Ligand binder design. Structure first.
Ligand SMILES: CC(=O)SCCNC(=O)CCNC(=O)[C@H](O)C(C)(C)COP(=O)(O)OP(=O)(O)OC[C@H]1O[C@@H](n2cnc3c(N)ncnc32)[C@H](O)[C@@H]1OP(=O)(O)O
Ligand SMILES: CC(=O)SCCNC(=O)CCNC(=O)[C@H](O)C(C)(C)COP(=O)(O)OP(=O)(O)OC[C@H]1O[C@@H](n2cnc3c(N)ncnc32)[C@H](O)[C@@H]1OP(=O)(O)O
Lengths: 317, 317
């Protein structure tokens, strides 16, 4: 067996699907979108039996800015790691992760995270991969708390509009709104979300995927919505092969801090979901939510669907 | 609004699906099988707005034997409870559960369990219903640990046979094996599992759904397997609408204690899964597993799919 770099995406995707595809179905379109577009220092290492790929690890160092956030070179990520099911418990996963970690560490990394990277596949260790928690624990990762993707079928329920105090307008974005959107982001959400807006417009997000809320003419919040015509495969629709025909998604969503807890986020979510409903969306997902926010969406009949554990390894000096 | 008994199964099923059907799709066949066949003292109470059902609770007292286990009348169950999404946070769930609990309590109940009943729909509070944990906590239920349904696609992987020491034979059950199976159950698994064997043969399980392992002629273990020709809808195939065409399932599985940790359970599981594979099964589920046993199945490419929390309320004297 040899560990060496591989950019054979079909082989990686095939191995991904054979092992975990029941619950994380992968397609080449998504895999290449996410791997190729990522701007961090990144590598894929494979484990090989002759010509046969039997496992891989994908890993990154935070070397490229996030909005107004400087990159912190102290931080590295394990985007994913899979050993083929016919080759488990032979030390291959260990050797893969030792190779990744040793490189990151030589390049200045002191904090290693499971998923949560830019262009992630996972917010954390998936619940369907719960046995791997013990793998990471054995290597010095600490387990933390959970994030959730939520699922709902927007065609099955009707809701009544939160009562609209006047002045607040909710509408799909137009091109001329881009400046006002960016200025609102630098103000309120100027890290990863700002960066995602910049990058996602570069990889095929269109104005029709964005809903804006304004008080008068000031942009005071936004959501991003997905359906089967979106060009960019964003996190809400990663696992679209599980979601049937007329799938969709939503996230992120945000409201200017000085406008919070007045019912406006609820109005924004209400209007976003009506748009999707009118687009004939059925099953849809809200990705990467915290526990304490579930009920916000749960009022609209969303339920936790997938769970992920944050996990972090602090490198010893 | 009125609370009163209802046996309008279509209405109950329709409400079930509108609210939670994305993740627990229900059909009338399953709902009636499970409700009607249950032998415990049982009731369904509904919450009504005039003629419209807006919520229900299904509850049971343990009044009928389980194998060699006497029924313990101290124990009651909440099989399920759903308030319609348009009527939440109005106290309806509270009134439903107060009605159920007050009855059980008058009839001698001192321990109340969330799911886990005979003919259950849930081993515990589903993860997709995680927000309800707070509902139960507010009412005095304590949250305990988790059980898991596992999912795997048996058509995607090949495995090699655990090395067979001679004497041990693994085969589908025949009619003449029923005595030896029962005698082995009274010995090794004489509670709920014995009872399930008795009852499940009464509701359409056939010899083809049972795999036996024998040393010589003594039955030393069994599994129960499911495919799309099974007559009985058992727990592994409850949520078959999520599992596609050629769905299947497995569970329970057991080996005589004096034969454990010798590789025989693995052989039994191996052979059971080959049978399913040859039956052309694809996606299949192993229901209601504990954490510490996941890796047993995980060797065969099964992954946690759904999670449920045990929860129990001790009634105050
Ligand atoms: C950020 C993310 O990518 S999260 C997703 C993680 N990936 C997955 O869950 C995909 C499916 N699982 C896998 O691909 C593999 O099981 C891996 C990658 C987790 C581990 O690969 P392997 O080649 O089996 O691991 P390796 O043989 O190096 O195991 C090292 C030790 O880790 C621990 N370990 C590994 N797997 C397990 C397990 N399933 N349960 C408990 N402990 C485990 C053990 O101590 C093991 O030593 P042992 O074999 O002496 O018991
Ligand atoms: C064994 C099983 O059946 S497990 C599955 C449980 N069922 C479900 O999860 C199905 C979907 N959910 C529901 O049907 C409902 O949300 C129910 C049945 C859990 C609760 O019904 P309701 O009619 O909303 O509950 P009710 O209004 O009586 O709530 C009482 C209190 O419980 C607590 N509670 C209820 N729902 C929630 C929630 N989603 N998050 C936090 N606390 C809650 C609150 O303290 C609430 O008081 P408040 O309204 O003053 O905050």
């Amino acid at each position: 067996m040899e560990i060496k770099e591989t950019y054979d995406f079909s082989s990686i995707v095939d191995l991904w699907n054979k092992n975990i595809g029941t619950v994380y179905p992968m397609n080449l379109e998504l895999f290449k979108q996410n791997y190729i577009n990522d701007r961090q220092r990144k590598k894929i290492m494979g484990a090989f039996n002759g010509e046969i790929l039997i496992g891989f690890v994908i890993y990154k160092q935070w070397t490229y800015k996030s909005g107004s956030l400087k990159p912190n070179h102290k931080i590295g990520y394990i985007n994913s790691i899979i050993v083929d099911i016919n080759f488990r418990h032979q030390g291959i996963g260990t050797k893969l992760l030792d190779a990744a970690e040793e490189e990151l560490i030589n390049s200045g990394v002191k904090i290693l995270r499971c998923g949560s990277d830019t262009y992630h596949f996972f917010p954390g260790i998936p619940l369907e991969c719960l046995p791997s928690e013990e793998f990471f624990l054995v290597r010095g990762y600490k387990m933390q708390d959970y994030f959730y993707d939520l699922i709902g079928d927007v065609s099955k329920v009707d809701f009544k509009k939160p009562s609209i105090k006047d002045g607040f307008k909710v509408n799909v974005m137009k091109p001329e709104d881009r400046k006002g959107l960016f200025e609102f982001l630098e103000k309120s959400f100027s890290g990863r979300w700002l960066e995602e807006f910049i990058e996602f417009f570069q990889v095929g997000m269109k104005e029709r995927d964005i809903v804006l809320i304004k008080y008068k003419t000031s942009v005071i919040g936004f959501s991003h919505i997905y359906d089967n015509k979106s060009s960019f495969i964003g996190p809400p629709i990663y696992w679209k092969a599980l979601l049937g025909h007329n799938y969709g998604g939503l996230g992120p969503i945000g409201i200017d801090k000085t406008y919070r807890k007045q019912g406006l986020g609820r109005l924004l979510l209400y209007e976003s979901l009506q748009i999707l409903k009118k687009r004939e969306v059925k099953k849809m997902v809200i990705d990467w939510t915290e526990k304490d926010i579930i009920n916000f969406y749960g009022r609209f009949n969303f339920m936790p669907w997938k769970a992920y554990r944050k996990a972090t390894k602090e490198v010893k000096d």
